[PDB]
Amino acid sequence: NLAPLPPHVPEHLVFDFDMYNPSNLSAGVQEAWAVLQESNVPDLVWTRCNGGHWIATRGQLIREAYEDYRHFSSECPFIPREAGEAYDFIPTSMDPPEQRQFKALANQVVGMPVVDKLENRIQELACSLIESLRPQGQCNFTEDYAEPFPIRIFMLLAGLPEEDIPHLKYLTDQMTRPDGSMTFAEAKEALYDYLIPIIEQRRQKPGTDAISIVANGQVNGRPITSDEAKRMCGLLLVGGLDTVVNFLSFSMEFLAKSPEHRQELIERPERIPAACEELLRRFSLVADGRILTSDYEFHGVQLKKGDQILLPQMLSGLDERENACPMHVDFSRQKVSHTTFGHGSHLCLGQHLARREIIVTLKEWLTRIPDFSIAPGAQIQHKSGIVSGVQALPLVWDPATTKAV
Ligand code: HEM
């Protein structure tokens, strides 16, 4: 389904890439997206899929566009346009200076001090989850750890019932990896229907949870409104349920295939932090964009007001001009360059929480289950979207080789 080429788009700048169903998906989602970085592809292209939009294929441009909010606005960050228009999460749908105020409050509920406070709990859940799987000798990583671990920690932070996970997770997934079952506006509607009552109650009888903190916060000297609280909370929800979840599978899929990398971390644990960054670079998984606020010429290409442009955060670290041998995982890289957590005034607020959950998982898993692999006959399938993911990850191991700690 290709849309007719706009009058201002040069025919030679056309490359029909479908961010929701890339061609070589079978080889891995990152590999599938990296085709945009082949010699035959210009730095800035236009695809006719999903309504027609631009795509910046180089780290340099991606960074530039993200730094220039004057021309590239957050107002419409999702593709297709229908989704981006219905998109109203705070603070991502807003540009600075406005953005700053809300960013500050959000940082209060998921910032560093909060992570430091939840450390022991994160460590406890990881250990408990793993120890319970260790003797089984097998599991579907995606549903047995990748999902429960980060999500339960979030529900704990938000003070929400673990019984709502299935419902909430489904709605989130429809927003990043659309099933066609429902439009973005509907998924968004459903999620807000869930939050409104809760925020209401949290305004009258406040608690210590992130939701209470947000629902009763102060922005620009005055108090936050219900709508504003609802829109910010909706964003924390999507971030807490559909980000770390997927990243952990990509990483575990790789560690399961690379004994030498597992070994390296087991012997030189001081390398884990560095390893975490390299994996964040190699298995980057986010791709959203911006909207042109006016006609603007970007690197020789003429962009028209209203044009939407995808700035794949995942491509920056795969660009050979930024990292030599991009597809190779090297824990000892002198300089690990990436924009996995974004770039510009919208740099990820939950990156500290994320890194903590990743580093804990790596350390605690390899301690108890140092040797594991992917189940025979299983074919690991990836899925593309605003946030890419793994369908399932069947792992197997000899319990006799595990270590109860
Ligand atoms: C590996 C995990 C994660 C990745 C790769 C990631 C990636 C990103 C990216 C690329 C952005 C920038 C989007 C843009 O500029 O349009 C972002 C924003 C954000 N992330 Fe994360 N994120 C992760 C985990 C989290 C978690 C766990 C939370 C917390 C619940 C979270 C909350 C946010 C928020 C609130 C923003 C919006 C900040 C703003 O608009 O100013 N993220 N994230």
DSSP 189-200: HHHHHHHHHHHH
* Residue bearing the CA closest to ligand 1, atom 6: 341
- In the block, tokens 């406040």 appear at 206
Q: What is the DSSP letter of 326?
A: T
Residue of 129, 265, 349, 353 marked catalytic: 349
For 294, other C-beta atoms within 10 Å of its C-beta total 11
The span from the CA of 136 to the CA of 138, in Å, is 5
* Residue bearing the CA closest to ligand 1, atom 21: 348
Q: Quick one: which H or E segment has residue 30? A: helix 29-33
For a substitution probing ligand 1, which of 73, 279, 348, 358 has the most ligand atoms within 8 Å of its CB?
348
* Residue bearing the CA closest to ligand 1, atom 40: 92
Question: Is 242 assigned a catalytic role?
Answer: yes
Question: Is 221 assigned a catalytic role?
Answer: no
For the chain, which domains are there? 1-405 (1.10.630.10)
Question: Is 129 assigned a catalytic role?
Answer: no
Distance separating the N- and C-terminal Cα atoms of the chain: 54
Contact 244, 150 (CB under 8 A): yes
* Residue bearing the CA closest to ligand 1, atom 20: 348
Question: Quick one: residue 114, left, alpha or beta (phi over 0 = left, psi -120 to 50 = alpha)?
Answer: alpha
List C-alpha distances in Å: 122 to 106, 115, 156, 244, 300: 20, 9, 10, 13, 49
Q: What is the 3-state secondary structure (H, E, C) of 351-382?
A: HHHHHHHHHHHHHHHHHHCCCCEECCCCCCCE
List C-alpha distances in Å: 259 to 246, 262, 300, 361, 373: 21, 5, 46, 17, 9
Contact 153, 121 (CB under 8 A): yes
Residue of 81, 152, 177, 271 marked catalytic: 177
The span from the CA of 332 to the CA of 205, in Å, is 51
For this PDB entry, the determination method is X-ray
Contact 106, 128 (CB under 8 A): no
For 207, other C-beta atoms within 10 Å of its C-beta total 13
Question: Is 177 assigned a catalytic role?
Answer: yes
* Residue bearing the CA closest to ligand 1, atom 18: 348
For residue 213, report the distance from its CA to the centre of ligand 1, in Å: 19
For a substitution probing ligand 1, which of 105, 243, 360 has the most ligand atoms within 8 Å of its CB?
243
Q: Which residues pair with 378 in a beta bridge?
A: none
For residue 314, report the distance from its CA to the centre of ligand 1, in Å: 13
List C-alpha distances in Å: 254 to 127, 250, 264: 21, 6, 14
Return the ∠ at Cα 350 (arms to 345 and 354), rounded to 5°: 135
* Residue bearing the CA closest to ligand 1, atom 42: 350
What residues contact 361, with CB distance under 8 A and at least 6 apart? 126, 145, 149, 248
The span from the CA of 274 to the CA of 362, in Å, is 12
For residue 124, report the distance from its CA to the centre of ligand 1, in Å: 24
For 291, other C-beta atoms within 10 Å of its C-beta total 22
Residue of 243, 340, 361, 402 marked catalytic: 243
Pocket of ligand 1 (CB under 6 A): 77, 91-92, 103, 106, 110, 235-236, 239-240, 243-244, 247, 286, 288, 313, 340-342, 346, 348-350, 353-354
The atom number, within ligand 1, closest to the CA of 237 reads: 30
Both tokens assigned to 149: 């671990």
Q: Read off φ and ψ for residue 109, nearest 5 degrees.
A: -95, -15
Q: Is 309 exposed, middle or buried (0-12, 13-18, 19+ CB in 10 A)?
A: buried
Q: Does the annotation place 233 within a ligand binding site?
A: no
The span from the CA of 380 to the CA of 372, in Å, is 15
DSSP state string for 262-315: HHHHHH-GGGHHHHHHHHHHHT--B--EEEESS-EEETTEEE-TT-EEE--TTT
